Ligand binder design. Structure first.
Ligand SMILES: CC(=O)O[C@@H]1[C@H](O)[C@@H](O)O[C@H](COS(N)(=O)=O)[C@H]1OC(C)=O
Ligand SMILES: [Zn+2]
Length: 257
């Protein structure tokens, strides 16, 4: 099926997933000088105090830190969002080199990686139904640049050795996603899609202006993961990012001037 290699990569997805060429695909390039400050946006509210992480899994495309979303334990509200969006998982996209890896770009600039915290609109009862709605999901995107270490990320980095290959998973309780946030919640926002198949156009993207720094040693460990299952020839997990798509009939709004 789909992947990021030369033969199954994003340039091919449209064949199985025609929506790949759709009205509101992600990611996109964020042109800081075309984005419009929107004074009517409410402050963004990240409420990750009761967050309950459960497990980390290598699914052959990325690794997912999964959260207990049977209740409003960790939610996202405010900003451009209507209602309550519940945290289900976070994951990353990254490159084979520090100059690439992010999905969204800022004035065409690629970051070394991009963290995605995925939430679903609780008005729809479950994730499956929410992906079928134009306001079904809210993904909080955070850029990673290489520099000094992010201590809050290190717990994640150390467990990757135990989920090297596709299908593997490890326990991952008591992780606090608040340690992954930058100091500022200034953001850009636009309507978009999942960035992997099925590429459903159900996402309100919230992309933070301020990157977090991670060390080269931290990102290197991301790059030791495998796309392949155990006992197969090694395909390093790198460059699992979709390039920017056309903005078309959309506007990006900023929470700041
Ligand atoms: C459970 C799972 O497979 O998660 C996917 C995975 O984390 C990652 O490859 O990105 C996808 C792309 O989503 S992302 N980039 O839009 O936020 C995720 O897909 C979805 C449906 O959550
Ligand atoms: Zn993602």
């Amino acid at each position: 099926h789909w992947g990021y290699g030369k033969h199954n990569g994003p340039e091919h997805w449209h064949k199985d997933f025609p929506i790949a060429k759709g009205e509101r695909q992600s990611p996109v390039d964020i042109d800081t000088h075309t984005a419009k400050y929107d004074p009517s946006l409410k402050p963004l509210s990240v409420s990750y105090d009761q967050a309950t992480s459960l497990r980390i899994l290598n699914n052959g495309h990325a690794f997912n830190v999964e959260f207990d979303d049977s209740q409003d334990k960790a939610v996202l509200k405010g900003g451009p969002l209507d209602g309550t969006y519940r945290l289900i998982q976070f994951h990353f996209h990254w490159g084979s080199l520090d100059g690439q890896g992010s999905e969204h770009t800022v004035d065409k600039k690629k970051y070394a990686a991009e963290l995605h915290l995925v939430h679903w609109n609780t008005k729809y009862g479950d994730f499956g139904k929410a992906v079928q709605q134009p306001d079904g999901l809210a993904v909080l995107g955070i850029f990673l640049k290489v520099g000094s270490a992010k201590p809050g990320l290190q717990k994640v980095v150390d467990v990757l050795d135990s989920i090297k290959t596709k299908g593997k998973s490890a326990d991952f309780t008591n992780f606090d996603p608040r340690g992954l946030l930058p100091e500022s919640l200034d953001y850009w926002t636009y309507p978009g899609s999942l960035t992997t198949p099925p590429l459903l156009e159900c996402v309100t993207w919230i992309v933070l202006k301020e990157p977090i720094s991670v060390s080269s040693e931290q990102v290197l460990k991301f790059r030791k993961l495998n796309f392949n299952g155990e006992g197969e020839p090694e395909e390093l997990m790198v460059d699992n990012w979709r390039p920017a798509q056309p903005l078309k009939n959309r506007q990006i709004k900023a929470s700041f001037k």
